[PDB]
From a paper:
The HIV-1 envelope glycoprotein (Env) mediates essential processes of receptor binding and membrane fusion to initiate infection of a host cell. The apex of the HIV-1 Env trimer is composed of V1 and V2 loops layered on top of the V3 loop. From structures of antibody Fabs bound to the well-characterized clade A BG505 SOSIP trimer, it has been recognized that the epitope for bnAbs such as PGT145, PG9/16, and others bind to a quaternary epitope involving a basic residue charge “sink” as well as the conserved N160 glycan from more than one gp120 subunit15–17. We also report cryo-EM reconstructions of the apex-targeting PGT145 bnAb bound to two divergent Env that exhibit different degrees of structural dynamics throughout the trimer structures.
We thus applied HDX-MS and single particle cryo-EM analysis to examine the bnAb Fab engaging with a highly dynamic Env trimer, from isolate BJOX2000 and a highly ordered trimer, from isolate CNE55. The cryo-EM structures, reconstructed without symmetry imposed, were calculated to a global resolution of 4.87 Å for the BJOX2000 + PGT145 Fab complex and 5.14 Å for the CNE55 + PGT145 complex according to the 0.143 FSC gold standard criterion. When compared to the BG505 complex, PGT145 nestles into the apex ~4 Å lower in the structure of the BJOX2000 complex along with an ~5 A downward shift in the PGT145 light chain position while engaging the N160 glycan on BJOX2000. Furthermore, the glycan at BJOX2000 N160-2 is shifted ~7.75 Å from the reported BG505 N160-2 glycan position in the complex structures. This may give rise to the downward shift of ~5 Å in the case of the Fab light chain (LCDR1 and LCDR3) of PGT145 in the case of BJOX2000 complexed with PGT145. Here however, interactions are seen between N156 glycan-3 of Env and HCDR2 of Fab in the case BJOX2000 + PGT145. In the BJOX2000 Env trimer, two regions, the CD4 binding loop in gp120 and HR1 in gp41, were identified that exhibit clearly broadened or bimodal isotopic distributions. Surprisingly, PGT145 binding did not alter the profile of bimodal spectra throughout the BJOX2000 trimer structure, suggesting antibody binding had minimal long-range allosteric effects throughout the trimer. We speculate that the more labile interprotomer interactions in BJOX2000 may permit the PGT145 HCDR3 loop to nestle deeper into the space between V2 loops. Moreover, though the overall structures are similar, variations in glycan and protein loop positions are seen in the BJOX2000 complex when compared to the CNE55 and BG505 complex structures. These observations demonstrate that the PGT145 antibody is able to accommodate those differences in local environment in the more dynamic BJOX2000 Env while preserving its common binding contacts.
Residue numbers in the entry:
A (entry chain N): 2 to 27, 27A, 27B, 27C, 27D, 27E, 28 to 108
B (entry chain J): 1 to 52, 52A, 52B, 52C, 53 to 65, 68 to 82, 82A, 82B, ...
C (entry chain F): 520 to 545, 568 to 664
D (entry chain E): 520 to 546, 568 to 664
E (entry chain B): 520 to 546, 566 to 664
F (entry chain D): 32 to 141, 150 to 185, 185A, 189 to 309, 312 to 321, 321A, 322 to 398, 411 to 506
G (entry chain C): 32 to 141, 150 to 185, 189 to 309, 312 to 321, 321A, 322 to 398, 411 to 506
H (entry chain A): 32 to 141, 150 to 185, 189 to 309, 312 to 321, 321A, 322 to 398, 412 to 506
Write the structure that this text describes.
Amino acid sequence: VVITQSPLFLPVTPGEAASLSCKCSHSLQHSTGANYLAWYLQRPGQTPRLLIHLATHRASGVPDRFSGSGSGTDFTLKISRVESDDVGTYYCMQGLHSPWTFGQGTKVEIKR
Amino acid sequence: QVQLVQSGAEVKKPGSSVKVSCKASGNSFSNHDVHWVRQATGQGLEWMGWMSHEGDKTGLAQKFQGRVTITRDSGASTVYMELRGLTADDTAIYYCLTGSKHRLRDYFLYNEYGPNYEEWGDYLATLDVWGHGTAVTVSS
Amino acid sequence: LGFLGAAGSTMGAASMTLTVQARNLLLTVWGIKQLQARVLAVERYLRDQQLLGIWGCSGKLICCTNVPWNSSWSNRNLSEIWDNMTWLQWDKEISNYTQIIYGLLEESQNQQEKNEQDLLALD
Amino acid sequence: LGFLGAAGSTMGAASMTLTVQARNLLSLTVWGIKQLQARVLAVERYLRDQQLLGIWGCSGKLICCTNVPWNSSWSNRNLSEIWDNMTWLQWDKEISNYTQIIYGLLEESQNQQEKNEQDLLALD
Amino acid sequence: LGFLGAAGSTMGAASMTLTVQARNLLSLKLTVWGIKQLQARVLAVERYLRDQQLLGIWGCSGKLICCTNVPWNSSWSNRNLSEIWDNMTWLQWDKEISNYTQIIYGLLEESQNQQEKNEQDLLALD
Amino acid sequence: ENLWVTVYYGVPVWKDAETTLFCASDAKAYETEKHNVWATHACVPTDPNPQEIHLENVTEEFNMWKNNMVEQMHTDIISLWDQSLKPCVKLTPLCVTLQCTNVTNNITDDMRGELKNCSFNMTTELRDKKQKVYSLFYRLDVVQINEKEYRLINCNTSAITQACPKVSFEPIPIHYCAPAGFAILKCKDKKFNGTGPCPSVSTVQCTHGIKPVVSTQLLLNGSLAEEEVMIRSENITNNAKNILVQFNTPVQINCTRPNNNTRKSIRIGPGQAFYATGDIIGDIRQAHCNVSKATWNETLGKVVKQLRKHFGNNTIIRFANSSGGDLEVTTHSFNCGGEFFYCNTSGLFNSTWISNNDSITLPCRIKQIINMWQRIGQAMYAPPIQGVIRCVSNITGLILTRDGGSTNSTTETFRPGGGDMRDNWRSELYKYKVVKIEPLGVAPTRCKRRVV
Amino acid sequence: ENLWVTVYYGVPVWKDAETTLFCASDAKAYETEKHNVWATHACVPTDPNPQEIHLENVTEEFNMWKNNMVEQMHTDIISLWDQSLKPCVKLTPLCVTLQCTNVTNNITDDMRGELKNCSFNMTTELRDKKQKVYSLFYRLDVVQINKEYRLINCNTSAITQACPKVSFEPIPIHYCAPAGFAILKCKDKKFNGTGPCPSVSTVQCTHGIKPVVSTQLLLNGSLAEEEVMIRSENITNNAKNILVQFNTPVQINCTRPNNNTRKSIRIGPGQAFYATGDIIGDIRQAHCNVSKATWNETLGKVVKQLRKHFGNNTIIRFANSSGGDLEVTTHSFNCGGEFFYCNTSGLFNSTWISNNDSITLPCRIKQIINMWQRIGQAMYAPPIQGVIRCVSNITGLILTRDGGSTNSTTETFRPGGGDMRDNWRSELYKYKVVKIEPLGVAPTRCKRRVV
Amino acid sequence: ENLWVTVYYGVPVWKDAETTLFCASDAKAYETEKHNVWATHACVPTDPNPQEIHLENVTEEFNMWKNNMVEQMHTDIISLWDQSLKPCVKLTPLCVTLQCTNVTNNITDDMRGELKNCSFNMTTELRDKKQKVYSLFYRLDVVQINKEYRLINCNTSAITQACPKVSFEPIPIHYCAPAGFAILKCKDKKFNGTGPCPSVSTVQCTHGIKPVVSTQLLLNGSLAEEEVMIRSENITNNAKNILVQFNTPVQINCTRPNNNTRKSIRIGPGQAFYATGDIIGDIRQAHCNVSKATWNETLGKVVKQLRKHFGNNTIIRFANSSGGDLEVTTHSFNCGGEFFYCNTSGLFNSTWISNDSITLPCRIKQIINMWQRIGQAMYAPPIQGVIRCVSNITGLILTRDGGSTNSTTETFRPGGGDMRDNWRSELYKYKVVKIEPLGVAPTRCKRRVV
Ligand SMILES: *[C@@H]1O[C@H](CO)[C@@H](O[C@@H]2O[C@H](CO)[C@@H](O)[C@H](O)[C@H]2NC(C)=O)[C@H](O)[C@H]1NC(C)=O
Ligand SMILES: *[C@@H]1O[C@H](CO)[C@@H](O)[C@H](O)[C@H]1NC(C)=O
Ligand SMILES: *[C@@H]1O[C@H](CO)[C@@H](O)[C@H](O)[C@H]1NC(C)=O
Ligand SMILES: *[C@@H]1O[C@H](CO)[C@@H](O)[C@H](O)[C@H]1NC(C)=O
């Protein structure tokens, strides 16, 4: 099983909604229908943090600006009204099939 | 929050073995899955090893087979990693962390006159608070 | 001289095969049925021997009781009874008065002659 | 005319229903096991009685008056005042203990000796 | 006297313990012992019943000794009646007469019983 | 005068003994519909009119509690129950932990905390597939695992099985006949006590029909007392012995479940179908039972008048609530309609008697899983029955316990108890005994055998 | 002078009745080898000398379809079957799923899709370990889950099988009456399904009986004496099956051309599983063999007999089966320890009118057996190695008459009678059981002598 | 004047036949406790007077090695044991793998490695839960799969144990011939197994016999009357076992020197299971002691008896067995509710030429495959405490090695793994016949013409 993230990085205009994409070689759906995908944003200079888990609901304390979608193999993470404290690196994880892996990552940065 | 302690930075010769330590306050290792993650400056993230919170299941990255081992003290209050066959390219930062998993049954034969046949599947839930980490560099 | 040879003969001539007829009167599901059939035959034979002992003609293939019977049951002469009709057809003709016959033979003769035998033995 | 009707009768009056009592003397489930046991017990007891009858030579007879005298210490009643007014089992409770002695005497003292006498008579 | 006391006696002294010999002629619950006992009782009652029905067929039923009229062929045995009676036990006597038994039974029924039935039928013809 | 003892055969003889009973049913009338556990697969048909024979000049002792037919038929019914449940389905996979919530929809206020809806991890018919199954349960069958998740009561104990819903539990009037060479005696006394001779004696070859009713305090749809209310016990002095009661006149018992129950079907394995309670339609109403009150004290007045014969005629007689213990004797139970009922007889006996508008109700409880008999090595689950059930039943007796520690022969009180159904079968069969008839007999006479 | 009745005992009397029967085997010749289902490897044998006794001057009324010996023997055969199957192991665990792929290469172009290669992820004899087995399966025995497949009978009662050394081939089984009972049989050359028999005979015990299982054609039955015989409860009624019997044998041959092998499979301790191994050589469909001119002559005789009870100008037809479950659509027999299914429409494609040498039948194999009409039992046959070859006789037919046929013309028949009670009645049509009453009375000139 | 053959009834006749016998126990002595495996709950009590008479001038031929009551008896023990086992629990769930460790508690150096700590995940009162509980096992009943072990007999028939309230102690069994049959015995104390017996006598019921369970030496039954005696079907063929019967007993002690602790577990509903708990105190090997003087002098008696049928001045040797299946390899017996296995090699290191105690180790096993059958098996329940056993040895079953030369230097080894020998060593006195009370003979009888 292989996983891809796109784009590698993207310029951002502050205060404008944006989306991110992660793709994998096989469907993430479980025999019970469960999806095993969690998005993580890592600030440079510190550790990543959970944003949305299992493709359905944001983590506790996450602002409503985040939103995730997709099913099976393709999944997306859309953030509304992106601002300066959103510049960083975004990762999609793997939780359905051993070994657990992570996507290549997407970098959000303010356009300049 | 649970406090995490790791060994200090070390300088080691190539082609030798390196030992490291970790500690969690309150013996949270019993309730949280043990993990070990390396990262090099300017490159992506890679997981090396893990040890279940019960201490019953372990796994290693296939790139690290035959060079690493899983150890913990009595009561699992601490954990110790031994790293072997290290060269200059293995110089990176090594991290001790806890996590969460899913223990779910996959297959089962219900047995009328005995215990059911059962196989379990361990699936990660989330990776919990990290330690401060340890930096290991390899040089002459 | 085989078994049931008299079936082709008249009821008069059937009298010569009575001993031949009497000769053959005597955990797996097959074993269960074997036990059940053997016992069932045993109680059958004991039932018939009970009746014979109650009539007092036990141990003899033939018994000459002194009881006359109403001929209204079959108004035919014994010559044509024995020389023409088979024993089966005689039984078919006489099938229904059987229980009355059993009762009158059991009571009107046996206990009275037993009581008179006791009276004679008194003297 | 019903079964066991002689209970309300004396010994003399009980003498007409003997055959009536004798008529029904013998006439994977645990249930079936129970009926098998009942049948075999009934037949073994009936054969007990019949082999006793064969030993005593009274087989096939409801009454069998013997040549055996009895010592009078056992009962203090005489024949008329026994027969005409009293019940078979008041008599049987009176007699119930000497039954083994009746067994032994009525068998050995008479039956075997009489058989020997029949053999002697048939000898000539 | 004790059972099987006539085994040591001749055919003379054996004639007085015949009744003693005949005295014992017939005598969960899923246990194997109980099953065996049921089977054994069934076998014993069957053998006994066969014995007395055979005796009734021969017509000497109810008699511990019977006095028949059957003739026979003299080639079967080799001794006089007195020596037969005194010098030998019923056991080796049967051993001497152990092959003519079926012929003897067949004669005992067919030559006597049914013919005397015919004769008593002729008597009843009156 | 040298009389000789002479043989007689066929004389009637009575001698107490024990043999195996013979089943009997009136022409196998149960065949009209299938199927019944008590009628079983088969029993011997019988003549509708057994010949009753009343015996003149004959008196005979009849002793209760010394009879052995009672425990023989006790064994017969326990064996029948086990055999009937034998071909049915084991239910062990059903007692994994249960996730439950309180049912509060269309339920009466007093009915809260009784009906419960639970879900659990039970597989499908297929080997590798699991299904989520929910049903409505009663609290009386479930216990907490910790101080929430819940589990039923009986997976400490022996395995659990289901009653096959294709055979009914309704009782069938059963006849009994003696083996060959035996007969059954009937005491014709109208006021017969428990022990001693019976001045008027009769006999039967087969007995009347007896309903194998299971009840714990109240004799239900049995026989009536022919003249007056009847009290029996082994020894009145001994308070450890139970007190039989037999009513001269019966009053009916009405018992229904007002709730319209529904049922669903679940699969376990190959040929394994399970039945469970579905949602209930209508307002949940507690099961009740109503009986007239005026008849009730009139009957207690008769009972107390009979009671005062065996005590001081100026004491005080009071009745009360059961002393406690397990529910099977603490409350009253009955099977009406094919399912069991647990009703509070506490207020039934609330009265006190001194020297010299019409019907009352009783709340009732319902139980599915039952430890039938006193047995602890087996258990069963009653199948749910849809619709609305109804039972109409007489009352034919009471079963009582007398308090100890009484002094000066005054202030006697009584309580129900003694769940031994052997008492019920005594109170049914207590008119009959089994006796062996010996045809043999040897008596003196003037007959001397004819000379050889 | 007035006659008195007297007592007779031992007189001959037969009455209609019913009683349980016994085993009787051909001198227990099979005792040299183990094991056969029908004889339990042991029952009471018989002497070779039962003496048939003709009953001169005697006629007897017989009746089939109401005599109960057939039904008692049917329930006895069911009891023998499930008794022989009780001691041997069950097959509960195989109701798992199945991943499957088609059997390829070294195949006939006509078999494509018949055989399926499926594998298992089942556990071992040791309860904590998992393994992987594969086996060969017929297409008819398996049903798709929704490629993946599942066994057809796992939503019904469980299937049991083990224990392969036991044999299924018939042994002649006799039935001797209990004491006080005898056997009567009808001597005439031709006999209806009911009616008096002018000449009758009695025997102590019956002749050899085969319990063989046949669906649409009678096998190994005794030959008809003079001509093709037709029987039924009532010819007019169309809910009753018709009987057909042959005076002359019609020989069939059946063989399984594939060289098959068997594997040993372990699932539970003390439990041996056998499944069909990889077939050696090219796959070829099994077939049967019957002559052409013979089949013509038999059907000509059949229609000639059919002409008797109907209008002589009526047009006779036979046809394709009507459909439904395979147990009545096809023809089935177990010869060679294997159940064969195939389709007699090729043999009933014909039509008669007033006034090279063989035919081939495509035939099928089923490994799952819902024997009889039961739903609570099942069995999986053991794969038999090598090539099986069967020789057999055909002596009878069972047909049904279609509805309509208005105005007394154009009569048609189709195969039917899928109840083997018809097979056993078609065998036992000769024997009846009667009740003996040794007691009796009669008048006589005799009066009891005084004292 | 010519004779006339005439029927007689009551005639005593004997003739070889076979039926099934009557169970008989001494006055129902076992009814006091519930219940012996063999006696169960029900049989006919014995006659308080087992009357015996000597036959007057009668001799009879007996043919042992041809008796069928021995095989009937063997089948009867089989049926009784299976009947006892049937209403008990199955131990198939124990076939899961066991991890095992070598733990000793002040063990002796000759006992090291025989008892193991083994445990398994087991089941609970609920199918959802599992729990790990340890137990102790002998080295015999396990096996390494490739440490971790499994039960030795899981690749064969299932293992079944329950119902500990049954008693393993034998009781003598009488046997009575059915109606119409009889039992005949030989009085001659030097009588062979076969040949005519000059002094014969009849009995209604044969004397009570214990179902003794042993393999190498006969135990705790009847004694030879006046000297030791030896029997064999043919003294030539080596395939036949050699029976030896002693005239004087040999007292035996055997013991297990340690108390035992038992714990119970509930594998399922109604499925309580008993296992061996931890044993306190020093671990010492179970063994047996027996006087040396009786052993060697009784062996001298046996050699004196054995020299009769050879041409004397022939060397006689006994030796260590050749090995094989453990049942025939070691001396096995049950006492105190536990099965034993003993190495009788040290008892026979001596040869014989013309003209105060001994010890021996033993062994304990808990999974026993009864007789030679492999389709059934049982687990013995642990017996609490120290087992103390006293017994008499009444005989020995022997085998003769083939080969050698000049009919000299005869060697012998124990053998005969068929317990048929155990039963026949006492059944060889008795024999059954059929009685036909009817008989015929000539006479002067002419029935009175009527
Ligand atoms: C194996 O053979 C079967 C037929 O025996 C093929 O089944 C077909 O599957 C397709 C797709 O599902 C259907 O449209 C057809 O109707 C099926 N045929 C029949 C006769 O049912 C199957 O495709 C074959 N598989 C391979 C890999 O060749
Ligand atoms: C029954 O017996 C008791 C005590 O023996 C006695 O008090 C009572 O009066 C008796 N009743 C009858 C009706 O005989
Ligand atoms: C019922 O008992 C008497 C009737 O005699 C009556 O006086 C009494 O009041 C009634 N019971 C109650 C509780 O009112
Ligand atoms: C009490 O008086 C009643 C009259 O109603 C009488 O029957 C009874 O014997 C008396 N009992 C006592 C103890 O006085």
